[PDB]
Amino acid sequence: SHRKYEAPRHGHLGFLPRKRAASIRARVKAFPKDDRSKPVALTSFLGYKAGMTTIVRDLDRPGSKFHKREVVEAVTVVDTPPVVVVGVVGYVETPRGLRSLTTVWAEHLSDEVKRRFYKNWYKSKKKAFTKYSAKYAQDGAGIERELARIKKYASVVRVLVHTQIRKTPLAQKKAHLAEIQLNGGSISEKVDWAREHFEKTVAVDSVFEQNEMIDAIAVTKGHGFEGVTHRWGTKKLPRKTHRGLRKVACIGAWHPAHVMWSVARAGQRGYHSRTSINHKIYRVGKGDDEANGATSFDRTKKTITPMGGFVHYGEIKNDFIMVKGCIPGNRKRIVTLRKSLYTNTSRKALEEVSLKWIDTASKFGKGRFQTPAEKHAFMGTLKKDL
Amino acid sequence: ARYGATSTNPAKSASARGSYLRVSFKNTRETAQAINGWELTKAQKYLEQVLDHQRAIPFRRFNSSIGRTAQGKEFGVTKARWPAKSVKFVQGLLQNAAANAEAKGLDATKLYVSHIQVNQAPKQRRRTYRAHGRINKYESSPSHIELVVTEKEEA
RNA sequence: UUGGCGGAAAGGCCUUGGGUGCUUGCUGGCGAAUUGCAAUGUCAUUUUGCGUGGGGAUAAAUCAUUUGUAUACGACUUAGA
RNA sequence: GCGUUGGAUUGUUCACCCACUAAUAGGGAACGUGAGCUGGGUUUAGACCGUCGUGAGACAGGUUAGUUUUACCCUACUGAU
RNA sequence: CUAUCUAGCGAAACCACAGCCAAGGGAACGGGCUUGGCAGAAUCAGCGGGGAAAGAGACCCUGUUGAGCUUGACUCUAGU
RNA sequence: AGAACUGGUACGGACAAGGGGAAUCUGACUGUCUAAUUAAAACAUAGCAUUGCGAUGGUCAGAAAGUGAUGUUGACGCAAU
RNA sequence: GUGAACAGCCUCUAGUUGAUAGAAUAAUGUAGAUAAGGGAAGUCGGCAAAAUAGAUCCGUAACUUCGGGAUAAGGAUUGGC
RNA sequence: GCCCUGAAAAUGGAUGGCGCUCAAGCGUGUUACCUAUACUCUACCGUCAGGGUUGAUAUGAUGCCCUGACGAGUAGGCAGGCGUGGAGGUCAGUGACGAAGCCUAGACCGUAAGGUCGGGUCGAACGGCCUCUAGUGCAGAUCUUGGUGGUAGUAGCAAAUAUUCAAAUGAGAACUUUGAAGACUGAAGUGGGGAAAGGUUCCACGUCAACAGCAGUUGGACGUGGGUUAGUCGAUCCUAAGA
RNA sequence: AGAACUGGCGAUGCGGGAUGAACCGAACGUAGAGUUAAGGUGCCGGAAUACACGCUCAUCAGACACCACAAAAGGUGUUAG
RNA sequence: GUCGAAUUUGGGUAUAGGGGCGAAAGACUAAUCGAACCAUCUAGUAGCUGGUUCCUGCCGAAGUUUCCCUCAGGAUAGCAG
RNA sequence: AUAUUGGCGAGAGACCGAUAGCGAACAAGUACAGUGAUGGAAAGAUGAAAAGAACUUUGAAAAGAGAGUGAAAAAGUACGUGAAAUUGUUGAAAGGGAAGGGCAUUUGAUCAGACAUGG
Ligand SMILES: [Mg+2]
C-alpha cells in the first residue's frame, strides 16, 4: 500500500546482468564514424595499465576561481608499447548485420601471437599457421585473391593487431590480439594500408595526441560473490535484526508471487566490462626518452617510473599514454583505449594542457624523494657505500 | 551362487561376492558403475588413482548437493567424488575375482569386468539424541557387492 | 573445354568449341501374351557402419602441476620439453 | 521520463508545529512487505486505579510487567558450471 | 569459529498428485481448467516473493456439553 | 614522609576497576513469589488500630471416642481481621 | 610471585594435553575489535555500545528522621633510580 | 442513424486468439454449407407387456418360440449374480508322474463382480455341483500393527586456548604404547579423598563382531580369571523431632 | 433479505454460449447410415475470403441474448428525413 | 540482584487430593495443579465430526405441512420402493 | 432336587489358526518402564536325517571361488513357500515447464484361430 516515503532505487538497471564478463579483453562495441576524407589510421589501441601518479599544472579555464592557478590531478599511466599488424578482416553489410566475409593473415606470425592459439604451448608441435604460410609461395594468387575480395565487397575493414607483451614487465608470454577498424579514406586504400603493414608496427603517437579525449574499455577488477549491501548500496538493517542485517528486508510484495528482476540480490561484484568515456590525454610518452617524467618546468632526467617501480607492475620501458583521472581495470590488465565516437567541442575537452610537474616518489609507502639523487642529497652519506 | 542377470560364458568367467558389507550403498553403487565394463587392469589402475585424488568417481544418481570438480570432465560430468571406503571394498572383490580366475587358468590379459552390481543389505540401526527429549534413528546403509570378470572375445 | 558474371545465405548463372548417347522431323523390319478380369510391379535421399583403388595430411585438449589480473566449489587468467 | 526530504510531541495510521527545498502530490500491490526485522499499541495469565456490582467479577476507560519458532524441498529471483 | 570443497559418519520436518506465467470464468485471490505468452539435458552457492508452506481456532457462536468461582438462585447438608 | 636524578610527559602502563547530576509517579526500608513468557508499584514487614476469650473458655480438628492442635500456654496470652 | 586479597594474570608438586580430521578463506552469520568530522539527528525508549574506575592528598551543595545525603560534585598526584 | 466529446486505477493482456477497414465491423435480405448422446431406418444387449407351444411324440416348462414398446439418475428401495472361512450330501472328483500358494505389457470366457488355461516357481494337500452357515469382500476413518520411500549422501558431526616430530607394535596407526617438543588445569585444580548413588565399572591376560554419532591394534566394551582380611574404622549402644 | 406460479440446478452426462451448477438446444443401453437443433462457416476450426442494398474511419472505432456496465449534456463529421 | 542473615544447604522427621502447603503467584504438592498420580465403575453419553469393504438390472426422491425448551434434532403428513 | 468365568480329573466343538486365539503356541505376567500403586510387549516353521559343508585355493580376518553333503542349497543354523511397497543390475523404449487417461490408427514386438485333398 504505497511506500511510506520516497527514495530513488539502488543501482543502475542498465548495467545488468551483474555477471562475470565473458572474456577478460573487453569488447569494443562501436568505432568512430568513418570519415573517408582523411589518412588511414587505427581507431583504438591495445595496452597494459601500469598504475597511477599525480600531476601539477596550471588550469586554463577563464571564469573559474582556479583559472591561471596550479592544480594537482591524479593520472593513470597505461603502458603502451607499439602493436603489430598481422591481418585484415572485411565486413559486408547484410540484412542480418555486419558479417566477416574473409580474413587474410601475414606470411610470418610471431611466437607471442602464435601462442594465443594454444592452451598447452610448451608440450605442443607449434603447427599454428604453418600450412597457411604456404599460400604465399604461389607468388600471389591465394592471398591476392582475398585482398581483392575485400576491395570488391566489404563495407568496413578491420586490422588484426596484437600486443608485444614481451616488451612489458608481465609474466604472461601469450599476447593479446584484437580487430581494429581502419578509419582512413576508401575501402581500397584501407586494405592496401593494411597489406603494407603486415608484420610491421604501429605506435600510439600515430593514433593519439596531447589533450585528446579518449574512451577506455576494460573488464572491471574482480571481487567475487558480494552481499547485497556493497553490491547495490542498499541501506544496512538495524543492529537488532535477527539473522543478519547486510540484507534487504522486503525482497518483494505478496503479489506478483515472484521475486522480481529488479530487486537487489547477492552475487558477483566486479569483473564487468565497462566502456568509460572522455579521459583527456595528458602525455604521450616516448620509450627511448629518458625524460618521460620531466617537464619544461622541471628539467631533470627522470623516467616516468616511480622509485621502487610501479607497484605490482614494474618499470615503464616503452611509450606510454598518461590519461587524466582514473580508468576501469586494475594493474596488469589489458585495456583497449578507443578514441571518441563524437567531437566533444566542450571547453574542458578543448583545453590544451602543459604539465608542470610529474610525481615519481615511491607508491609503495609515504614516498619522500623523487630521485636517487635527491634522496642522497638530503640524507647525506650512510653506513653503507663509499 | 545365483547372481543377478549375467549374459556371459560361465567358463570364460570367474566371479566374486561380498555381503553385509558396511559401506555406503549409495557411494559403493556409484563407484561400481564407474568401472562397470572396464578391462580389469584399467579398472585396478584407475581405482588406485582415485585413492590418490588423481582421477575421480562420477556421481550420477545418488548425488545432489555434492560439490563440483575439474576431475569430472573426463566423464562429461561435473559432480564427482573420491569415496575411499568403497574403492577399497570394490578392490578387495576385484582382487578376489582375479584370484579365482587364475585358478581357472583364465588368461589375465583377456579379463574385463563383465558384470558388477551392488545393492542394499539390511539396515544396521543406531540411536541419535534429538532436542526436547526426542530420539531418532541413526542408521547404516550396508552393501552387497558382486562382480564377474570375463575373457574377452577375439574376432 | 574457351571466356565471363554473381557475397543478401554469392555455392548458382551466362558463354566458346568440339566429342559422345538418344532423337517421335519422316519411312521400314521385329518383339510384348500365360502377371490369367483390380489388389503388391518407377525407385527418391538421408544418415551410419563396414569392402575395395587412387589421391591426400602426420594434431591437440583435458587431469595432474603452476600463476593471482580470478576464485565458495566448478569456472577464469598465467607458466611448464 | 524523473524527483518528492530533515526534525520536536504521539505506538500510532492520522494529526500538529519547526525547518530546508525545484517540489515537500494522492493512491495500489492479501488495509504490499513478521520462516524480513522490530514488538511501542491493541489482544492471556501479575499488579494499581476510577466507575459499576452484595459478591465472584465487568468496563475499544486510565496504569505498569509480560518467550516473535523451522527452510536443507519445489518454484521465483541472484549469481555459478 | 562456521558456512564452503574433501574422507569417514549420517538424521528429522513435511509429502493427494505435482511444481513457469498473464487474463478469464470459478466456492467472488489457479500449479492443473479456458484463451493466449511460451517452452531444450544434468546441475552448484545463495535467497526469503509464492507453495493462502510447516507446527481437530484459545477469538466468536451453536450444544437442552462441562468445570473453577460468587450470591437471599433452586434443592439440600456437616455443624451449631 | 621528604629530596635529588632520569625518560618520545610516561607510570592503578597487563590485570584488576563507581559514570555523574536536576526531578516527577510509586513502595518506607533489608526481605518474598508466578521452577519453564510477568520480580513489580504485587506479598511480607516493623508500626497503628479493631475483635473474641478467665479454662464448665476462645479459635480450630475428628466418622466416633476415657480423641486432638494452640498448651511445657493464661490477657505483657492465645486466637481472628 | 604480583596485589588489600582464597580476585584476575604467571608458576611448582600432581594431573591432563580428551573432546572427527584435511584443504580453502565467497556471501550471510555467531563471537571479539577499531573508525575521520558530527554527537542521539537513530529509536516506543540511549536498547546495544562507549565513557568512569585502584590509591594518596585536596575539596564537597540542597535537603534531612541529624543517623545520613557522600566515592556527592569537582581537582592534583602515581614509573624508574 | 453510424461516428466523435463527455469516458480517471493500480503485475503485462485480451470482441477467446490472431487479425480485420466497399470488413473478417453496424442494419437488412437470399441461397449453400458444418455439427449433438436429439430425430428417421437397421443389427445386437437388456427390461416390461401381449401371445403361441410338452397331443404320442430324447437334451432346458422357472423351458423353446412370436410380437410391440421402452433404457438419465444422488439419497434411497427391491432384484439377479460374482468371491471368501467352515458344515451335510455328491462327482468311487485333482494330486509327490507335483496339491495349495506365488510370478508372468502369454492365451480364452463373462457387460461386470469374476472364471478358465499355458509357462516359470513351488512342495502336501485341494476342487466342481445341490444345500447349510457366518467373526464373509476396503482406498480412505489425523484408522490399528508392521514394513518401505522421496527428502539425502542432505541438515549436520564448529562451546570448553593446541597441538607437533620420531620410534615401537600391528594386516592396517591423525586416534594405541614409549621417547622428545609445544601447551593447559594453576590448589576456590583438569590435584589427593569421601557422603548419597551405583554394584564390579577395580586388577590381570586375551581380544575388536556389536558399542565409544571419524577411526581403533585403545576402552567404564567383549571373553576368561583374579581381588575387599579389624577387640581399636564404622554399624552395632544412646537418646532427637518423630515412629 | 423475504413471498407468488411455473420451469430448472441440486440428483444430469451430451451439443452450443472460449471459459462457466442454473442460459440456448437437447436429456443418456451397445453400434452403423442419413438428417438436424442451438450455435457457427477469413485462419486457429469442421463449414461460401458466398451473393445483395446501404451505413461506418475512430492520434480511446466496432464486433452478438443471459454477460461480464455506462449517464445528464454536446459536435458546421457524415447519412437519411 | 544480594552476598553475615527474615542467609544458603545435607540427612532425618511431619503434613496427602475438595486434602496438604502457600511472606498469596491460583503458586507449589516427583517435566502433572482453577483439584495430583494409579486401577476399576467404563466399550461412561454425544441431537455433534470422521469412516462404513463385491458386480450388474429396474424403479426413484426431499429440503414442504402440523406439533415439539422446537431453530445442526425428532414426531407427523407428502414425495419413494 | 439348586448355584458354580475358582480348584482337581476328564470327554467334546459347523470356535481361532501366530497382527487370529488368553497378555503369553517360545527361559510371559518374562524383557522393559515407573519412587510407588501399577503398566507390560515382541518372539512359532533348515532337512527324512546335520548328512551343519572334509579338502583345495585368494584373503589380516569376515568371507569369497572351487569341491563336497543332500531328493533339492531355486533348503547353508540370515535357513518351507518367499507376495507388495521400495532397490541393484541387464534389455527395449520415451522424454523443449509433470506424469497418468479416452476414441482412433501408423510403426515395432507378441499371440493366434485354422484342417483337410488326389500322389
Ligand atoms: Mg474488552
Short mmCIF file of C-alpha atoms (C1' of nucleotides) in Angstrom, two decimals, chain I residues 18-77:
data_model
loop_
_atom_site.label_atom_id
_atom_site.label_comp_id
_atom_site.label_asym_id
_atom_site.label_seq_id
_atom_site.Cartn_x
_atom_site.Cartn_y
_atom_site.Cartn_z
"C1'" A I 18 -13.84 -19.55 -25.35
"C1'" U I 19 -14.28 -20.22 -20.05
"C1'" G I 20 -18.61 -21.45 -16.63
"C1'" A I 21 -24.17 -25.68 -11.36
"C1'" A I 22 -28.71 -22.80 -13.18
"C1'" C I 23 -28.91 -19.54 -20.11
"C1'" C I 24 -29.89 -21.71 -25.54
"C1'" G I 25 -30.52 -26.77 -27.85
"C1'" A I 26 -31.37 -31.28 -26.21
"C1'" A I 27 -31.83 -35.42 -21.66
"C1'" C I 28 -28.23 -40.59 -21.92
"C1'" G I 29 -28.41 -49.17 -23.43
"C1'" U I 30 -24.15 -51.05 -27.43
"C1'" A I 31 -23.38 -49.65 -32.67
"C1'" G I 32 -23.97 -48.46 -38.32
"C1'" A I 33 -26.03 -44.91 -42.14
"C1'" G I 34 -28.84 -40.45 -43.01
"C1'" U I 35 -30.94 -35.58 -41.20
"C1'" U I 36 -30.93 -31.71 -37.88
"C1'" A I 37 -31.19 -28.39 -33.32
"C1'" A I 38 -28.98 -24.12 -30.60
"C1'" G I 39 -24.63 -22.15 -32.49
"C1'" G I 40 -21.49 -21.44 -36.47
"C1'" U I 41 -18.72 -21.35 -41.74
"C1'" G I 42 -11.08 -15.47 -43.20
"C1'" C I 43 -7.14 -18.60 -40.17
"C1'" C I 44 -6.74 -21.15 -35.25
"C1'" G I 45 -11.58 -24.79 -36.54
"C1'" G I 46 -15.35 -28.97 -39.28
"C1'" A I 47 -18.23 -25.33 -42.90
"C1'" A I 48 -19.34 -19.78 -49.05
"C1'" U I 49 -12.29 -14.57 -48.05
"C1'" A I 50 -20.82 -16.69 -50.60
"C1'" C I 51 -24.48 -13.43 -53.15
"C1'" A I 52 -27.23 -8.37 -52.36
"C1'" C I 53 -28.53 -2.91 -50.90
"C1'" G I 54 -26.73 0.67 -47.67
"C1'" C I 55 -24.07 2.64 -43.25
"C1'" U I 56 -19.33 3.46 -40.63
"C1'" C I 57 -12.78 5.93 -40.44
"C1'" A I 58 -12.41 6.39 -34.50
"C1'" U I 59 -3.83 10.10 -32.74
"C1'" C I 60 -9.51 5.96 -26.87
"C1'" A I 61 -13.66 2.64 -33.95
"C1'" G I 62 -16.52 -1.73 -33.64
"C1'" A I 63 -17.75 -6.72 -33.36
"C1'" C I 64 -23.89 -10.56 -30.73
"C1'" A I 65 -29.09 -12.76 -25.97
"C1'" C I 66 -28.35 -14.23 -20.13
"C1'" C I 67 -22.91 -11.30 -19.89
"C1'" A I 68 -19.20 -9.53 -17.82
"C1'" C I 69 -21.91 -1.73 -17.48
"C1'" A I 70 -22.26 3.45 -18.67
"C1'" A I 71 -25.39 8.93 -17.84
"C1'" A I 72 -27.14 14.14 -17.90
"C1'" A I 73 -25.19 17.01 -21.86
"C1'" G I 74 -22.67 18.27 -26.55
"C1'" G I 75 -20.49 18.22 -32.45
"C1'" U I 76 -20.67 23.35 -39.22
"C1'" G I 77 -18.25 14.72 -39.00
#
